[PDB]
Enzyme design. Structure first.
Site, mmCIF file in Angstrom:
data_model
loop_
_atom_site.group_PDB
_atom_site.id
_atom_site.type_symbol
_atom_site.label_atom_id
_atom_site.label_comp_id
_atom_site.label_asym_id
_atom_site.label_seq_id
_atom_site.Cartn_x
_atom_site.Cartn_y
_atom_site.Cartn_z
ATOM 1 N N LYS A 132 0.812 -1.215 0.000
ATOM 2 C CA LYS A 132 0.000 0.000 0.000
ATOM 3 C C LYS A 132 0.849 1.270 0.000
ATOM 4 O O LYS A 132 0.569 2.213 -0.745
ATOM 5 C CB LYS A 132 -0.900 0.046 1.242
ATOM 6 C CG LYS A 132 -1.958 -0.978 1.352
ATOM 7 C CD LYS A 132 -2.885 -0.641 2.549
ATOM 8 C CE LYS A 132 -2.228 -0.720 3.909
ATOM 9 N NZ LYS A 132 -1.746 -2.104 4.226
ATOM 10 N N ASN A 190 -3.018 6.056 6.155
ATOM 11 C CA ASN A 190 -2.338 5.038 6.952
ATOM 12 C C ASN A 190 -0.831 5.017 6.750
ATOM 13 O O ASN A 190 -0.117 4.474 7.600
ATOM 14 C CB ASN A 190 -2.953 3.683 6.591
ATOM 15 C CG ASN A 190 -2.530 2.566 7.535
ATOM 16 O OD1 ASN A 190 -2.919 2.534 8.705
ATOM 17 N ND2 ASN A 190 -1.754 1.623 7.017
ATOM 18 N N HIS A 201 -4.284 -8.849 10.878
ATOM 19 C CA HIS A 201 -5.206 -8.236 11.835
ATOM 20 C C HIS A 201 -6.262 -9.185 12.371
ATOM 21 O O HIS A 201 -7.376 -8.754 12.703
ATOM 22 C CB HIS A 201 -5.865 -7.011 11.220
ATOM 23 C CG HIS A 201 -4.870 -6.012 10.737
ATOM 24 N ND1 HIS A 201 -3.980 -5.413 11.591
ATOM 25 C CD2 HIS A 201 -4.604 -5.524 9.505
ATOM 26 C CE1 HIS A 201 -3.203 -4.587 10.902
ATOM 27 N NE2 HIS A 201 -3.561 -4.636 9.635
HETATM 28 C C1 UMA Z 1 -3.240 0.750 14.351
HETATM 29 C C2 UMA Z 1 -3.479 1.816 13.320
HETATM 30 O O1 UMA Z 1 -4.458 1.782 12.583
HETATM 31 N N1 UMA Z 1 -2.550 2.772 13.277
HETATM 32 C C3 UMA Z 1 -2.634 3.866 12.343
HETATM 33 C C4 UMA Z 1 -3.102 5.126 13.068
HETATM 34 O O2 UMA Z 1 -2.120 5.469 14.011
HETATM 35 P P1 UMA Z 1 -2.634 6.004 15.465
HETATM 36 O O3 UMA Z 1 -1.407 6.356 16.244
HETATM 37 O O4 UMA Z 1 -3.647 7.043 15.269
HETATM 38 O O5 UMA Z 1 -3.229 4.608 16.023
HETATM 39 P P2 UMA Z 1 -4.449 4.432 17.066
HETATM 40 O O6 UMA Z 1 -5.753 4.391 16.339
HETATM 41 O O7 UMA Z 1 -4.222 5.412 18.156
HETATM 42 O O8 UMA Z 1 -4.126 2.922 17.575
HETATM 43 C C5 UMA Z 1 -2.781 2.586 17.908
HETATM 44 C C6 UMA Z 1 -2.805 1.545 19.012
HETATM 45 O O9 UMA Z 1 -3.426 2.077 20.198
HETATM 46 C C7 UMA Z 1 -4.291 1.137 20.720
HETATM 47 N N2 UMA Z 1 -5.401 1.807 21.366
HETATM 48 C C8 UMA Z 1 -6.017 2.839 20.704
HETATM 49 C C9 UMA Z 1 -7.078 3.492 21.212
HETATM 50 C C10 UMA Z 1 -7.597 3.118 22.498
HETATM 51 O O10 UMA Z 1 -8.551 3.662 23.058
HETATM 52 N N3 UMA Z 1 -6.936 2.070 23.080
HETATM 53 C C11 UMA Z 1 -5.859 1.379 22.600
HETATM 54 O O11 UMA Z 1 -5.354 0.457 23.214
HETATM 55 C C12 UMA Z 1 -4.750 0.310 19.511
HETATM 56 O O12 UMA Z 1 -5.184 -0.967 19.844
HETATM 57 C C13 UMA Z 1 -3.540 0.282 18.601
HETATM 58 O O13 UMA Z 1 -2.779 -0.879 18.847
HETATM 59 O O14 UMA Z 1 -3.315 6.179 12.177
HETATM 60 C C14 UMA Z 1 -2.183 6.561 11.429
HETATM 61 C C15 UMA Z 1 -2.637 7.663 10.485
HETATM 62 O O15 UMA Z 1 -3.744 7.254 9.686
HETATM 63 C C16 UMA Z 1 -1.595 5.354 10.694
HETATM 64 O O16 UMA Z 1 -0.403 5.769 10.045
HETATM 65 C C17 UMA Z 1 -1.334 4.183 11.635
HETATM 66 O O17 UMA Z 1 -0.873 3.125 10.837
HETATM 67 C C18 UMA Z 1 0.021 2.226 11.451
HETATM 68 C C19 UMA Z 1 1.353 2.251 10.693
HETATM 69 C C20 UMA Z 1 -0.484 0.800 11.381
HETATM 70 O O18 UMA Z 1 0.085 -0.115 11.979
HETATM 71 N N4 UMA Z 1 -1.555 0.591 10.645
HETATM 72 C C21 UMA Z 1 -2.092 -0.731 10.475
HETATM 73 C C22 UMA Z 1 -3.565 -0.729 10.124
HETATM 74 C C23 UMA Z 1 -1.284 -1.460 9.393
HETATM 75 O O19 UMA Z 1 -0.629 -0.797 8.536
HETATM 76 O O20 UMA Z 1 -1.287 -2.696 9.446
HETATM 77 N N1 ANP Z 2 2.574 -6.556 -3.632
HETATM 78 C C1 ANP Z 2 3.157 -6.916 -2.481
HETATM 79 N N2 ANP Z 2 2.914 -8.135 -1.997
HETATM 80 C C2 ANP Z 2 3.503 -8.503 -0.854
HETATM 81 N N3 ANP Z 2 4.334 -7.815 -0.090
HETATM 82 C C3 ANP Z 2 4.572 -6.599 -0.582
HETATM 83 C C4 ANP Z 2 4.035 -6.079 -1.751
HETATM 84 N N4 ANP Z 2 4.501 -4.804 -1.936
HETATM 85 C C5 ANP Z 2 5.284 -4.564 -0.922
HETATM 86 N N5 ANP Z 2 5.375 -5.621 -0.059
HETATM 87 C C6 ANP Z 2 6.111 -5.731 1.198
HETATM 88 O O1 ANP Z 2 5.231 -5.269 2.181
HETATM 89 C C7 ANP Z 2 5.897 -4.543 3.203
HETATM 90 C C8 ANP Z 2 5.360 -3.150 3.314
HETATM 91 O O2 ANP Z 2 5.371 -2.470 2.097
HETATM 92 P P1 ANP Z 2 4.437 -1.119 2.014
HETATM 93 O O3 ANP Z 2 4.527 -0.628 0.614
HETATM 94 O O4 ANP Z 2 4.762 -0.216 3.156
HETATM 95 O O5 ANP Z 2 3.004 -1.838 2.275
HETATM 96 P P2 ANP Z 2 1.820 -1.502 3.447
HETATM 97 O O6 ANP Z 2 0.577 -2.142 2.900
HETATM 98 O O7 ANP Z 2 1.830 0.004 3.564
HETATM 99 N N6 ANP Z 2 2.349 -2.251 4.833
HETATM 100 P P3 ANP Z 2 2.224 -4.012 5.200
HETATM 101 O O8 ANP Z 2 0.766 -4.321 5.552
HETATM 102 O O9 ANP Z 2 3.188 -4.318 6.343
HETATM 103 O O10 ANP Z 2 2.707 -4.498 3.849
HETATM 104 C C9 ANP Z 2 7.371 -4.650 2.829
HETATM 105 O O11 ANP Z 2 8.022 -5.630 3.561
HETATM 106 C C10 ANP Z 2 7.368 -4.854 1.321
HETATM 107 O O12 ANP Z 2 8.524 -5.554 0.943
HETATM 108 MG MG MG Z 3 -2.088 -3.682 8.111
#
Ligand code: UMA
Ligand code: ANP
Ligand code: MG
Ligand code: CL
Ligand code: CL
Ligand code: CL
Length: 439
Positions: A115, A138, A183
């Site tokens: 993504k 995100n 997730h």
């Molecule tokens: C978990 C998630 O969706 N995180 C995204 C979020 O960050 P933010 O800091 O606002 O997170 P949040 O909604 O406060 O949650 C973070 C953590 O706090 C915990 N939490 C949150 C609220 C609450 O009442 N209690 C609690 O325990 C959650 O379970 C979670 O483990 O908003 C940001 C801006 O949109 C994102 O960049 C960030 O992506 C991070 C990188 C992520 O891990 N995303 C997941 C979905 C992924 O990529 O797999």
């Molecule tokens: N098409 C794809 N299929 C599988 N893995 C990928 C792909 N593109 C990137 N990745 C791997 O996915 C991880 C995150 O890449 P990123 O472009 O940040 O994706 P994301 O969706 O934002 N995060 P995640 O859910 O951890 O992949 C890295 O380890 C990349 O090497």
């Molecule tokens: Mg994710």
């Protein structure tokens, strides 16, 4: 939208929640904020005039609300939030708030892997065309911070969690790149419930960009007249592998020899196809979009070489937070000597067994840490060590590293059991790699 005089409650005192606090205050609305954690990370950044509640959800505030704004990290299935929904109280997220205000077309990107790479590529394609583009979601810049009357195109990376709370997205182009288990701690009805959340991205989208090689990316009622596909050997956008050479092709026409890209790997070539399809659908000129594919060098923490010294590559793939991402790192990986693979953290209830087929043979060692380290070490105990922390794992493996080896942090897990974010994990890995791997 008009929020004047409404009782607004924000759940989550992290990045998203703070961006929502600022959004409402700038419109003259003072929200209240709650978080289940006693000491959430945003606590000390909150403006002094905002009432806050920590350690639990406050049902007196939720049941009094006119609008509940839920950060993606809180489950809609939380009993207090489910009770508010049962009472008919409106629940939205920051992406919903954004969509109600945005005045430029939105390209929307979800998927289990790829993504951020695709989101960033589309942004670069827009910049190369001279378009004022806002890139966020995100990927780490909260979307409400992008709102700008001069922005001509928004590119949003969206998670399944964000999509669950979004109802007003009408993207000019939307994709689900792929669907692989992630997730599961948040989806107790399993893979199809997680998929259903992602499928929301296509609702009211003008063009849907689907992966011809992943049937779970296809819209909810089936592929339709809006659907454009990308894939490896098939799709409107696809690849062709000549003699030692790969091209991006679009409807029977070569558009790019991938030797001109700085990224490599089949999954990054399909990421490039998806980005091109989205950019084409958004109306960006093809020529400048192709140029951007040749200038983009990759993102930190995504298979990032942080040190190459004494014949050893130290690779920070901290963004590999699920099994499919680590599989993309290992599939076809070439290592002259031994792969020292760091695994661990918060596994989010994942089944790690798909990784085992990549871990046979005499040239792989596992170093497993964090909350779920033991489950990862069980993939092949005879080549695995378990530590509490990543630092312990790195100090254990470093004496064993020989020229030709690779040290790979591709942990298949989230970082929040031990780190602030996956960037901190990758940055710590890079610091330790330099200490342990260089003179
Ligand atoms: C978990 C998630 O969706 N995180 C995204 C979020 O960050 P933010 O800091 O606002 O997170 P949040 O909604 O406060 O949650 C973070 C953590 O706090 C915990 N939490 C949150 C609220 C609450 O009442 N209690 C609690 O325990 C959650 O379970 C979670 O483990 O908003 C940001 C801006 O949109 C994102 O960049 C960030 O992506 C991070 C990188 C992520 O891990 N995303 C997941 C979905 C992924 O990529 O797999
Ligand atoms: N098409 C794809 N299929 C599988 N893995 C990928 C792909 N593109 C990137 N990745 C791997 O996915 C991880 C995150 O890449 P990123 O472009 O940040 O994706 P994301 O969706 O934002 N995060 P995640 O859910 O951890 O992949 C890295 O380890 C990349 O090497
Ligand atoms: Mg994710
Ligand atoms: Cl308002
Ligand atoms: Cl060809
Ligand atoms: Cl994380």
């Amino acid at each position: 939208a008009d929020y004047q005089g409404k009782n607004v409650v924000i759940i989550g005192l992290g990045l998203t929640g703070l961006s929502c606090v600022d959004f409402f205050l700038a419109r003259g609305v003072t929200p209240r904020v709650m978080d289940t954690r006693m000491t959430p990370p945003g606590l000390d950044k909150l403006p002094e005039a905002v009432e806050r509640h920590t350690g639990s959800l406050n049902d007196e505030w939720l049941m009094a609300a006119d609008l509940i704004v839920a950060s993606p990290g809180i489950a809609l299935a939380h009993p207090s939030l489910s009770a508010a929904a049962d009472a008919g109280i409106e629940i939205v997220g920051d992406i919903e708030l954004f969509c109600r205000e945005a005045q430029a077309p939105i390209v929307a990107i979800t998927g289990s892997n790829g993504k951020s790479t695709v989101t960033t590529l589309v942004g670069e394609m827009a910049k190369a065309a001279g378009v004022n583009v806002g890139v966020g979601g995100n990927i780490g810049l909260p979307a409400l911070m992008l709102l700008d009357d001069e922005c001509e195109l928004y590119v949003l990376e969206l998670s399944s969690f964000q999509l669950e709370t979004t109802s007003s997205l009408q993207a000019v182009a939307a994709t689900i790149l792929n669907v692989t288990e992630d997730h599961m701690d948040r989806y107790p009805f399993g893979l199809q419930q997680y998929r259903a959340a992602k499928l929301r991205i296509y609702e009211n989208a003008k063009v849907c960009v689907v992966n011809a090689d992943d049937a779970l990316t296809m819209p909810i009622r089936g592929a339709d007249e809006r659907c454009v596909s990308f894939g490896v050997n098939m799709g409107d956008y696809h690849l062709n592998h000549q003699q030692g050479e790969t091209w991006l092709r679009v409807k029977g026409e070569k558009v790019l020899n991938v030797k001109e890209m700085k990224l490599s790997g089949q999954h990054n070539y399909t990421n490039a196809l998806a980005a091109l399809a989205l950019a084409d659908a958004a109306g960006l000129p093809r020529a400048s979009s192709l140029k951007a594919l040749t200038t983009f060098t990759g993102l930190p923490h995504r298979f990032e070489v942080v040190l190459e010294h004494n014949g050893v590559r130290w690779i920070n793939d901290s963004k590999a937070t699920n099994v499919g991402s680590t599989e993309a790192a290992l599939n076809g990986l070439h290592v002259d000597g031994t792969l020292h693979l760091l695994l661990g953290g918060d596994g989010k209830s994942a089944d790690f067994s798909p990784l085992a087929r990549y871990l046979n043979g005499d040239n792989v060692r596992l170093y497993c840490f964090g909350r779920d380290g033991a489950q990862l070490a069980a993939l092949r105990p005879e080549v695995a060590e378990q530590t509490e922390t990543m630092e312990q794992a790195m100090r254990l493996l470093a004496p064993r590293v020989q020229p030709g080896d690779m040290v790979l942090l591709s942990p298949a897990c989230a970082s929040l059991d031990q780190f602030k974010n996956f960037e901190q994990r990758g940055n710590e890995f890079a610091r330790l790699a330099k200490e342990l791997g260089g003179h």
